[PDB]
Ligand binder design. Structure first.
Ligand SMILES: [Cl-]
Ligand SMILES: [Cl-]
Ligand SMILES: [Cl-]
Ligand SMILES: [Cl-]
Ligand SMILES: [Fe+3]
Ligand SMILES: [Zn+2]
Length: 338
């Protein structure tokens, strides 16, 4: 049941691990989803790539420098496009004195340092590189093809998933931020940290998502007047000190190399990288998502955003509600625990 909605860590055996879709179902049966985020640590024998040495030669065609502005736990961010570089160049940049992780005592100490130094040197990341770095033939937890209900409708019904169910690579350095968001269409996400330094995550229970939104609206009124789903721009930073102060429940956890993090529908999350690293991610869905997708608040201020038609999912997996829904009389409030 997980009534504290705390972030759960799972440690499957090889036998439990083999089949992603079954294990996700297990995780939700233990209440993992209530926290909005969960960690899965695979068995020690499982290795998605034998050698990472080659990844040095990969090009980051569009690195981004993150420009953070604000104070006292509230910040807005904008991006500057830098020249293309290799991962090798990026790593060497990341480990230089200008950009390297500071000295610290423990993860709590480093967390304080992140929030206290956000507006000094601007860090650089590489994101949204199409690709997977799993070895060929690795069939467990293959982010390139998890084969969820998103793939079923794409392949069997010719519906466009708008590229969200394909794999992306991310290269972080110290202090790179991921601002507060839920996923496109409030889908699930999965993130595997291949190598390098840890990522720290914050998550807010889906049952408190609307409360985070109301608070963001209060503190970032101009951003809000501009877009009904502005947090989707991923440019809004809010510190845990502010969340505590205004009564928004949340939890944090640190993801180490070799660990998966899964985000759940409408689980607001954010975080920062500890240092040079490489991660791979994608979006996916289950039947339980369909109700969130149907009510997802979309970005109303630029046409280059992801919108997926929910018609097929309702027709196929909610046939008893389809007519009602097309009448615009399928009105409900989601029970996030169930
Ligand atoms: Cl230092
Ligand atoms: Cl620093
Ligand atoms: Cl499903
Ligand atoms: Cl049908
Ligand atoms: Fe995310
Ligand atoms: Zn917008």
């Amino acid at each position: 049941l997980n009534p504290s909605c705390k972030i759960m860590t799972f440690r499957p055996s090889m036998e439990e691990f083999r089949e992603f879709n079954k294990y996700l179902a297990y995780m939700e049966s233990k209440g993992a989803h209530r926290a909005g985020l969960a960690k899965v640590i695979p068995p020690k024998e499982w290795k998605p790539r034998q050698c990472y040495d080659d990844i040095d030669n990969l090009l980051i065609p569009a690195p981004i420098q993150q420009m953070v502005t604000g104070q006292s736990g509230l910040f807005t961010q904008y991006n500057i496009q830098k020249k293309a570089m290799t991962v090798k160049e990026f790593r060497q940049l990341a480990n230089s004195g200008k950009y390297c992780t500071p000295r610290y005592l423990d993860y709590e100490d480093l967390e304080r340092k992140y929030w206290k130094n956000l507006t000094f040197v601007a860090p650089i990341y590489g994101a949204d590189i199409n690709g997977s770095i799993y070895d060929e033939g690795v069939d467990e937890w293959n982010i390139a093809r998890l084969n969820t209900v998103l793939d079923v409708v794409e392949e069997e019904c010719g519906i466009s998933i708008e590229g969200v169910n394909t794999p992306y690579l991310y290269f972080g350095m110290w202090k790179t931020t991921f601002a507060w968001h839920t996923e496109d269409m409030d889908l699930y996400s999965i993130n595997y940290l291949h190598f390098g330094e840890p990522k720290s995550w914050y998550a807010i229970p889906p049952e408190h998502g609307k409360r985070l939104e109301r608070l963001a609206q209060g503190f970032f009124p101009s951003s809000s007047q501009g877009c009904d789903a502005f947090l989707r721009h991923k440019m809004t930073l809010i510190s845990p000190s502010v969340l505590k102060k205004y009564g928004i429940p949340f939890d944090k956890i640190t993801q180490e190399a070799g660990e998966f993090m899964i985000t759940f529908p409408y689980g607001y999350h954010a975080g920062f990288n500890h240092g040079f690293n490489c991660a791979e991610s994608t979006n996916f869905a289950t039947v339980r998502w369909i109700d969130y997708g149907k009510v997802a608040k979309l970005c109303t201020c630029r046409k280059d955003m992801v919108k997926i038609s929910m018609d097929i999912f309702v027709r196929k997996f909610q046939p008893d509600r389809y007519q009602l829904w097309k009448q615009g009389k399928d009105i409900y409030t989601i029970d996030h625990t169930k």
